Design an enzyme around this catalytic site. Structure first.
Site, short mmCIF file in Angstrom:
data_model
loop_
_atom_site.label_atom_id
_atom_site.label_comp_id
_atom_site.label_asym_id
_atom_site.label_seq_id
_atom_site.Cartn_x
_atom_site.Cartn_y
_atom_site.Cartn_z
N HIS B 115 6.52 9.03 23.14
CA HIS B 115 6.34 9.22 21.46
C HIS B 115 7.82 8.75 21.00
CE1 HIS B 115 6.42 11.50 17.72
NE2 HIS B 115 5.11 11.43 17.45
N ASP B 172 4.53 2.02 6.14
CA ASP B 172 4.39 2.74 7.45
C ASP B 172 3.45 3.88 7.03
OD1 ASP B 172 5.17 4.10 9.71
OD2 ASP B 172 7.06 5.01 9.06
N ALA B 174 -0.09 5.80 9.20
CA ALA B 174 -1.04 6.54 10.07
C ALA B 174 -2.59 5.70 9.65
CB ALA B 174 -1.30 7.90 10.14
N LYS B 222 -12.66 0.91 7.62
CA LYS B 222 -11.52 0.52 7.55
C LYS B 222 -10.26 0.78 8.44
CE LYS B 222 -12.57 -2.12 3.32
NZ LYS B 222 -11.97 -2.32 1.73
N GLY B 304 8.49 2.81 0.78
CA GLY B 304 9.77 3.02 1.36
C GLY B 304 10.98 3.24 0.30
N1 LIG Z 1 5.05 8.13 16.95
C1 LIG Z 1 3.77 8.21 16.59
O1 LIG Z 1 2.76 8.32 17.41
C2 LIG Z 1 3.11 8.64 15.14
C3 LIG Z 1 1.66 8.62 14.95
C4 LIG Z 1 1.12 8.74 13.53
C5 LIG Z 1 1.91 8.64 12.52
N2 LIG Z 1 3.26 8.58 13.07
C6 LIG Z 1 4.31 8.24 11.75
O2 LIG Z 1 4.02 9.44 10.69
C7 LIG Z 1 4.26 9.03 9.51
C8 LIG Z 1 3.02 9.04 8.94
O3 LIG Z 1 2.98 8.63 7.43
P1 LIG Z 1 1.71 8.66 6.53
O4 LIG Z 1 0.63 7.87 7.23
O5 LIG Z 1 1.22 10.14 6.19
O6 LIG Z 1 2.01 7.91 5.16
P2 LIG Z 1 2.00 8.03 3.77
O7 LIG Z 1 0.74 8.55 3.30
O8 LIG Z 1 3.10 9.31 3.50
O9 LIG Z 1 2.42 6.88 3.18
C9 LIG Z 1 2.01 5.47 3.69
C10 LIG Z 1 2.80 4.35 2.93
O10 LIG Z 1 2.68 4.80 1.37
C11 LIG Z 1 3.90 4.48 0.86
N3 LIG Z 1 3.83 5.49 -0.20
C12 LIG Z 1 3.59 6.94 -0.16
N4 LIG Z 1 3.59 7.43 -1.47
C13 LIG Z 1 3.85 6.34 -2.40
C14 LIG Z 1 4.10 6.28 -3.81
N5 LIG Z 1 4.20 7.18 -4.60
N6 LIG Z 1 4.52 5.16 -4.24
C15 LIG Z 1 4.80 3.93 -3.20
N7 LIG Z 1 4.55 3.87 -2.30
C16 LIG Z 1 4.19 5.26 -1.79
C17 LIG Z 1 4.85 4.87 1.88
O11 LIG Z 1 6.11 4.40 1.49
C18 LIG Z 1 4.19 4.19 3.17
O12 LIG Z 1 4.66 3.11 3.54
C19 LIG Z 1 4.86 7.67 9.42
O13 LIG Z 1 6.07 7.48 9.54
C20 LIG Z 1 4.08 7.17 10.87
O14 LIG Z 1 4.89 6.08 11.58
C21 LIG Z 1 3.91 8.37 14.04
N1 LIG Z 2 -10.76 -14.85 0.28
C1 LIG Z 2 -10.50 -13.91 -0.39
O1 LIG Z 2 -9.70 -13.91 -1.35
C2 LIG Z 2 -10.82 -12.32 0.06
C3 LIG Z 2 -10.30 -11.42 -0.83
C4 LIG Z 2 -11.24 -10.13 -0.46
C5 LIG Z 2 -11.95 -9.68 0.44
N2 LIG Z 2 -12.29 -10.99 1.15
C6 LIG Z 2 -13.08 -11.02 2.26
O2 LIG Z 2 -14.36 -9.95 1.76
C7 LIG Z 2 -14.93 -9.26 2.87
C8 LIG Z 2 -14.71 -8.05 2.40
O3 LIG Z 2 -14.84 -6.94 3.46
P1 LIG Z 2 -14.81 -5.23 3.16
O4 LIG Z 2 -13.24 -5.16 2.97
O5 LIG Z 2 -15.69 -4.76 2.17
O6 LIG Z 2 -15.05 -4.61 4.59
P2 LIG Z 2 -16.24 -3.48 5.01
O7 LIG Z 2 -16.00 -2.21 4.35
O8 LIG Z 2 -17.34 -4.09 4.78
O9 LIG Z 2 -15.72 -3.18 6.65
C9 LIG Z 2 -14.21 -3.29 6.96
C10 LIG Z 2 -14.20 -3.46 8.45
O10 LIG Z 2 -15.07 -2.26 8.88
C11 LIG Z 2 -15.92 -2.60 9.99
N3 LIG Z 2 -17.21 -1.72 9.69
C12 LIG Z 2 -17.95 -1.48 8.59
N4 LIG Z 2 -19.04 -0.74 8.93
C13 LIG Z 2 -18.85 -0.40 10.14
C14 LIG Z 2 -19.64 0.49 11.12
N5 LIG Z 2 -20.85 1.12 10.69
N6 LIG Z 2 -19.21 0.62 12.44
C15 LIG Z 2 -18.17 -0.15 12.75
N7 LIG Z 2 -17.35 -1.07 11.96
C16 LIG Z 2 -17.75 -1.05 10.69
C17 LIG Z 2 -16.32 -3.94 9.64
O11 LIG Z 2 -16.47 -4.81 10.76
C18 LIG Z 2 -15.04 -4.46 9.07
O12 LIG Z 2 -14.01 -5.28 10.08
C19 LIG Z 2 -14.24 -9.60 4.14
O13 LIG Z 2 -14.77 -10.42 4.98
C20 LIG Z 2 -12.83 -10.24 3.39
O14 LIG Z 2 -12.18 -11.08 4.31
C21 LIG Z 2 -11.79 -12.39 1.04
#
Ligand SMILES: NC(=O)c1ccc[n+]([C@@H]2O[C@H](COP(=O)([O-])OP(=O)(O)OC[C@H]3O[C@@H](n4cnc5c(N)ncnc54)[C@H](O)[C@@H]3O)[C@@H](O)[C@H]2O)c1
Ligand SMILES: NC(=O)c1ccc[n+]([C@@H]2O[C@H](COP(=O)([O-])OP(=O)(O)OC[C@H]3O[C@@H](n4cnc5c(N)ncnc54)[C@H](O)[C@@H]3O)[C@@H](O)[C@H]2O)c1
Lengths: 340, 340
Positions: B115, B172, B174, B222, B304
């Site tokens: 970790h 950053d 999860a 996603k 950040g």
């Molecule tokens: N070591 C491990 O195995 C492990 C596993 C899971 C998660 N983590 C850590 O735990 C933490 C979990 O973070 P999290 O997923 O809850 O993220 P989070 O939801 O708190 O935020 C995700 C991103 O959103 C941005 N964000 C949040 N509030 C915002 C605001 N008001 N305006 C603009 N940006 C904003 C943050 O700067 C961040 O980059 C992370 O630091 C991750 O690296 C570590």
């Molecule tokens: N050229 C551009 O400017 C532009 C801009 C935006 C989006 N796009 C494209 O539009 C498309 C938008 O895709 P989206 O965001 O709606 O994604 P989506 O929600 O349909 O799926 C996101 C991911 O989920 C996976 N997924 C979906 N259903 C699943 C299931 N039942 N089991 C397992 N995996 C599953 C897909 O394989 C995919 O990798 C993409 O191909 C993206 O590249 C292009």
């Protein structure tokens, strides 16, 4: 009725050449659009051909770019010269492969490109060549930043692919909760949408598609952070357009778009090993497929798996296309003397 | 009451050395935990020190790894030898910097780590050194795959950072909707949780934290796709543990964890240019900060930014820590003869 991919692809290429695009560009666009439709991603399939051709007609797309490329070690910069996104992107894929084969890693920073369709297609191609691939592209702003009420970033998708014995893992996702195309659709069907999709002009979530002013980021802050990751790699780092500087393909016709893309290919051979990687991917794939399903599901799928099964079925029995799209394509073909 | 970071850091280092960790390892862990607390990410701060020390006591963490490193071109593989995650990760950061400075890109595949805390700390460090950085780590499975009812992947976070004139962009996140720590918290406060956080043993969403069997992926498919991206880069590609092969830090004490990490550093100098990149990041940062706020917000922040403001305030007026955490740390210090 269903349509044959070979017929649609040949037709699209012929139409594009008649419209002035060179052979490589015509082939690249036909490929990108038809391959997207085959995988069930119609939002980036042939329904886009009409506007692509209109952009070309207007002199906003280079019909025959030379695609200047400069490399140093594992890094390459590609000038798309405003050519069709698929044409520019496929050249980038070629460069990424060559660089990764020689250096273990291959990064390509693309600038002055245009809309390139489904990002996952490029990632998948690299993965089928044996690489772990990362592909990103920015797009004209349609999404508000977390906490904001005015558009700041495009749907900016991230695609990632890796080869496995059972198939190609293909993650391909927009960083926004939804997409304008789905909102417009809801507008026509007069249906409510999840308030998570967009906000009104005041910046408040709305369940009325008629009131959507902008899209919202996926999972609040996280999708916003991911959209920035895509913007930094695709636009800031490459020298391409950034956010409002990209150019709206549907709304702005005064100058060509300057879309940026970022591609990274990694050779497993320089890490755990090519065959070892394949085996490990196989174990992971197997474990996921063996996962008992949650209610409403019969089995778990890998990202890209359903897309592959859909393409296989579409090749075997033909492709389904919306009557509206077929009508537009037929009209496009007729005005160019390329019969559908 | 508030505590001084300098006091906490010195104390943590002293405790770790008394517990047997070498100086580099002790310093690395003290840094990672205190810096996380400063930024408001307590989930990966000092509250983790007790278990970290217990793992060390049990002989599950290498107190003095030599950290074997092998490089070829822009790629390096690092064997953490089961050392403390922060110690292993900081060495990887050093390697990524060196490689990127010489090749334009620097990728480090880490295996046999443990970790490592907040992924964003490593990305931020690289960004402050002038690089665009990508950092990922896998973790023991706590999340069901989309459509499944049994745990398949860890919270697998992705971190990305880039320097700007106004500060360091640090994404950053999860890839899960929430985290077990937040679920346990809700369990104590007897509060309902959003059904988007987790599922029960049957695989159905639940609003009762007492019934949570596993976490759900961020935004359905996603987050699942992103978790796989992290698993492929962090574990499959590196030779480290993958999913169930990683080892649960809190539950499994029969063998050391085999956590994997992936770090990528990119030199803007080999792309658009160092100074040009800085300016472009500055324009983007400025545009975002100028974005009118949505209801409930006074202004837009960059990922950040809030973390940095929190760290600045914490350095200026001291750090706040939960009474429960302080109690545990004091007890830990007492049994080792290192007074708090
Ligand atoms: N070591 C491990 O195995 C492990 C596993 C899971 C998660 N983590 C850590 O735990 C933490 C979990 O973070 P999290 O997923 O809850 O993220 P989070 O939801 O708190 O935020 C995700 C991103 O959103 C941005 N964000 C949040 N509030 C915002 C605001 N008001 N305006 C603009 N940006 C904003 C943050 O700067 C961040 O980059 C992370 O630091 C991750 O690296 C570590
Ligand atoms: N050229 C551009 O400017 C532009 C801009 C935006 C989006 N796009 C494209 O539009 C498309 C938008 O895709 P989206 O965001 O709606 O994604 P989506 O929600 O349909 O799926 C996101 C991911 O989920 C996976 N997924 C979906 N259903 C699943 C299931 N039942 N089991 C397992 N995996 C599953 C897909 O394989 C995919 O990798 C993409 O191909 C993206 O590249 C292009």
């Amino acid at each position: 009725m269903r349509w044959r991919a070979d017929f649609l692809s040949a037709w699209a290429e012929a139409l594009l050449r008649k419209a002035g695009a060179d052979e490589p560009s015509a082939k690249a666009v036909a490929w990108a659009l038809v391959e997207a439709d085959l995988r069930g991603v119609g939002s980036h399939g042939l329904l886009r051909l009409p506007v692509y051709v209109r952009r070309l007609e207007a002199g906003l797309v280079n019909p025959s770019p030379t695609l200047p490329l400069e490399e140093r070690g594992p890094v390459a910069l590609l000038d798309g010269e405003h050519g069709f996104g698929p044409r520019v992107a496929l050249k980038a894929v070629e460069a990424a492969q060559s660089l990764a084969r020689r250096h273990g890693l291959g990064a390509v920073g693309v600038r002055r490109s245009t809309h390139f369709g489904m990002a996952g297609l490029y990632a998948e191609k690299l993965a089928r060549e044996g690489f772990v691939a990362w592909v990103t592209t920015n797009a004209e702003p349609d999404v508000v930043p977390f906490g904001g009420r005015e558009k700041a970033l495009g749907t900016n998708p991230l695609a990632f692919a890796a080869p496995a014995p059972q198939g190609i893992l293909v993650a391909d996702l927009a960083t926004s909760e939804s997409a304008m195309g789905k909102v417009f659709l809801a507008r026509e069907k007069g249906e409510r949408i999840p308030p998570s999709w967009g906000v009104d002009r005041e910046g408040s979530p709305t369940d009325d598609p008629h009131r959507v002013y902008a899209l919202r980021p996926l999972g609040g802050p996280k999708g916003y952070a991911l959209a920035l990751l895509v913007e930094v790699l695709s636009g800031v780092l490459t020298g391409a357009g950034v956010a409002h500087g990209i150019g709206r393909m549907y709304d702005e016709w005064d100058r060509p778009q300057d879309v940026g893309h970022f591609l990274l290919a990694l050779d497993p051979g320089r890490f755990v090993g090519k065959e070892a990687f394949l085996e490990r991917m196989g174990a992971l794939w197997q474990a996921l497929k063996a996962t008992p399903p949650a209610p409403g599901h019969e089995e778990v799928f890998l990202p890209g798996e359903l897309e592959a099964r859909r393409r296989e079925r579409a090749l075997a029995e033909g492709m389904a296309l919306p009557e509206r799209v077929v009508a537009e394509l037929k009209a496009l073909g007729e005005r160019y003397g390329v019969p559908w």
